[PDB]
């Protein structure tokens, strides 16, 4: 019968043959101190961006921001890791964990962050989280002492110059991790989507274990959609008391993406995310609900149970 794919899990309906991976890219040049994006839920709301037709004068409630203790940035060399873990360190004495983000083979080679790229971002489509990281293991291990191509991309998000190298070292995102004073977790999330059902239970599981005075520092790619996406969970699931509005805005004003609707004016060339976009607004409020709802537990309902008996509608 019905649906073939619901609301929350439209990505399945895609082809990941169509997109799978054709280049290491460059994820940071390495050049500033922090990666980009960085911010914390310590730091002070700034203006929204315009696009998002905010009330820049609306000041949401800071309740429970103190306590939240999250950051997210974008990719880092590993310097600019170790110069996030001081930052952190600043700020709190308990654990501190790297929450990578990101479904794509990724790693290090002679400490160059890089990812094996394909079209959208989505070399590791489809793939169970077991099945995207041992993608990961094979291919970043069968670089070393061979020759690669690493590049960044500019038009039409193809190779642009970039350098070649005969790799002499590879590393793991845990090892660099490792090395900056973090813990590390994985969450195999496809860039740009809602994460599955299973992503998020994996996190929520996860979530469950920690100390209460952990600090989780979450990355992806640009450190914006899907970075915003677990800092909002982690936000709500963590301060229930508070308003969704309040939620979205706060995380969008630390500078994160703000995910409540706004007008979406995309390219003719971008035409493929806008589901996208309107689907991850519609699930957030879901998970929103979520939260609300299975508070009187307990959470004695995981999400992905939750969810396929409470559908989001389209």
Known sequence: QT??????????????????????????DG?????????????????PEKKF?????????????????????????????????????????????????????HGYLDGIPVEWYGERNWANLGKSQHEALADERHRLHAALHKTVYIAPLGKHKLPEGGEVRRVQKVQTNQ???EAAGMRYFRIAATDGVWPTPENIDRFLAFYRTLPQDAWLHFHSHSGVGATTAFMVMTD??????????????????????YYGEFPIKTKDKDSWKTKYYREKIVMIEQF???????????????????LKSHPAKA
């Open 288 to 306: 929103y609900r979520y939260v609300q709802e299975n508070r009187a537990d307990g959470y004695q309902t995981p999400w992905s149970v939750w």
């Open 3 to 28: 649906v073939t794919e619901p609301v929350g899990s439209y990505a399945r309906a895609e082809r990941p043959q169509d997109f799978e991976g054709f280049v290491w890219r460059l994820l940071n």
């Open 236 to 257: 709500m699931l963590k301060n229930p008391s508070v308003s969704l509005k309040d939620i979205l805005y706060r995380q969008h004003e630390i500078g994160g993406f």
């Open 53 to 105: 037709h905010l009330d820049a004068a609306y000041v949401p409630s800071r309740e429970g921001m103190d306590a939240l203790h999250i950051s997210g940035s974008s990719a880092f060399t590993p310097a600019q890791l170790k110069n996030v873990a001081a930052k952190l360190r600043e700020k709190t004495a308990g654990p501190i964990y790297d929450v990578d983000l990101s479904q794509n083979s």
């Open 31 to 47: 050049k500033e101190a922090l990666p980009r994006n960085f911010r914390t839920s310590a730091d002070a709301l700034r203006a």
């Open 175 to 177: 090892e660099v991790a």
